[PDB]
Amino acid sequence: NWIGDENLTGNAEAPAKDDVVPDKNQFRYQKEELAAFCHFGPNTFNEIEWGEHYGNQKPSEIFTLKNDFDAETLVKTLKDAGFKKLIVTAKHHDGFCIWDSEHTEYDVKASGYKNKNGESDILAEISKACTDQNMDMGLYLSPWDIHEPSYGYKDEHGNPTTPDKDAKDYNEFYNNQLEEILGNPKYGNDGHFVEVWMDGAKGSGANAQEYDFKKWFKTIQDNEGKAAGYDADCMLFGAEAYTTVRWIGNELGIAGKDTWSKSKVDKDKNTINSNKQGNATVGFEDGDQWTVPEADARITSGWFWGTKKNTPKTMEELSDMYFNSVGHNATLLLNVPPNNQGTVDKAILDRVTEFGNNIKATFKTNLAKAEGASVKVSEVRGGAKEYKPGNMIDDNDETYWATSDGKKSGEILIDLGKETKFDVVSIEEAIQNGQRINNYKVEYRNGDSGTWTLLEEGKTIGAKRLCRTSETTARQIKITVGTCDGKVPMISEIGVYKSTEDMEK
Ligand SMILES: C[C@@H]1O[C@H](O)[C@@H](O)[C@H](O)[C@@H]1O
Ligand SMILES: [Ca+2]
Ligand SMILES: [Ca+2]
Ligand SMILES: [Mg+2]
Ligand SMILES: [Mg+2]
Ligand SMILES: [Mg+2]
Ligand SMILES: [Mg+2]
C-alpha cells in the first residue's frame, strides 16, 4: 500500500534530534562534498615531498618563483568544477612561509618574489581570488617546523636543554602566526577561514615539542569562530579531542563502506578514537562527537608538483575516488598543485575541468523525477504534508520524509515509469538532525510486481550514500532504511542516475 503526496492533512511534531549533530560549518562542509588542497612552496622548486635538507639556504635560493602567481586561473577552474573550498599550505614542514610574516625572515617576502604590484604574499594572492569568486578557504600550518629556531627545547645559544630552560617557546611563534593570518582581513574568503589543518605528521628523528593546543584553538576561534561572531566554530583537523574534521585514515580518497560522521573523544586526556577498520576511520554509531570524514588525495603522484610527478590521475581513478568518498559519507579533499611557474599545468587543469564536467553530467537528470515517474513510501509521519515523499526530490536539504513515532523503518518505492537504464542510486539522510540510520537495502525489478533483485545492502546513509553498479535496466527501485528502537529515519533527498561513460564502474 504505497503512499504519495496527495491528501496529506495530518499533523505531527518533528522527530527528536539525535544528541550528537553537526554544527553549521560541519553540515555545510558535508553538503559541499568537494574541497581542494593547494600544496605550494619551496618543495615545488626542488623535486621533493618533505623539504628536510634545505639547511641554511636563503629564501631566494629555495623559493625561486619569477612569474606572478596565477591565483585567478586556479580558483576559477576549481570553482567551475564544483569545489567549494581551497585549503592552502601557508607553511609546510620545511618552515617556509608563503605569506609576508613579521615573525620570521624565512618567507616569501625575503625570497625576492614580487607580483605585478611589487607585493610578496602568495596567501594574500590566493585569498583575493577566493574572495572574488566566493570560494571558502582552509589554512594548513605545519606544527612540525624544521627551520624555526624556537622549535624544540634550546638555550639562548641553541644547545638542547629541558622544557623549563627553553629560551624561545615555539607555542608562542605558532600562535603569533595564527593571529597574524587569521586576524588580518586580507587572508581568507573575506577574512574568514572555515577549517584549520594542524596535521601531526613528523619526522621520526625530529626533536620533542609539546603543543599548546588550547592556546591555538582559542586564537583560532577568537578570529574565525563563535567568539568572532560566526555561526559556528572554525573546523579543526589534527586537533586530537578537539578534532571536528577527521582524517579518513588513508591518502587514496577511500572511505569505508559504512562510514559514521562521529568519533569518541576524551577531552580530559585529549584523545580521540575514530574507529580504524582496515585502512579507514569508519567512526561509531554511538560516537559522542561529530567529526566530518575527510578523504585527502593527490591528483598527481605527489602533494607537490615536480617534473617526475605532473601526470594527473585518470577519470577512472578519480571516479573511483568520488564514489568511494562522497558516495560513502565522506568529503573529498583533492590536491591540485601549482608548478614552478606559479600556474597549473594545462593537463592538470584540464583533468580537473573534465572531472567536474563528468560529475555535473552524471547527476544532471534525476530519473526519479522524469515524466511518468513517481516516489511513494510505505508510511508518512502522521499523514502530514510536512513529511511527504515529495520532500525527497525537491532539491531542498531542509525538507525530508520520515515515518511516525514507533516505526523505526520505512520503504521508498521509486517507479521510473518505464523500463529504464541506470547505474547510480543516491540517498541522503537529514544529518542536520543526526546520523542514525543503521541498515539500508536497495532493490529493483522489471515491471510492477514479482520478486526484487538486490542491488546493495549496508548500514549507513549519512550525508550521502551512492550505490554504483553496472548498467542496469528496471522499472521500479525499492529503498529500505531503518534505525534503532525509539527513533525514525529522515531522508532529505534521493535520486536515480545513469553516469557518463567515464564515470561508469
Ligand atoms: C597533506 C599531507 O599532510 C601531512 O602532514 C604531510 O606530511 C604531507 O606532506 C602532506 O602535506
Ligand atoms: Ca623552543
Ligand atoms: Ca528535501
Ligand atoms: Mg546537495
Ligand atoms: Mg598573481
Ligand atoms: Mg618575514
Ligand atoms: Mg580572519
Author numbering: 23 to 527
What is written in the article reporting this PDB entry?
To access this source of nutrients, gut bacteria encode α-l-fucosidases (fucosidases) which catalyze the hydrolysis of terminal α-l-fucosidic linkages. The enzyme consists of two distinct domains, a catalytic domain (PF001120) domain comprising residues 46–366 in N-terminal and a F5/8 Type C domain (PF00754) covering residues 385–526 in C-terminal.
To further investigate E1_10125 ligand specificity, the enzyme was crystallized in the presence of 2′FL, providing the crystal structure of the complex showing the β-fucose anomer bound in the active site. Trp325 creates a CH–π interaction with the bound ligand and His61, Trp72, His114, His115 and Tyr162 provides additional hydrogen bonding interactions. In the E1_10125 crystal structure, adjacent to the proposed + 2 site is an open platform comprises primarily neutral and hydrophobic residues, which would accommodate Neu5Ac. This is in marked contrast to the S. pneumoniae and B. longum homologue structures where this region is partially occluded by incoming loops.
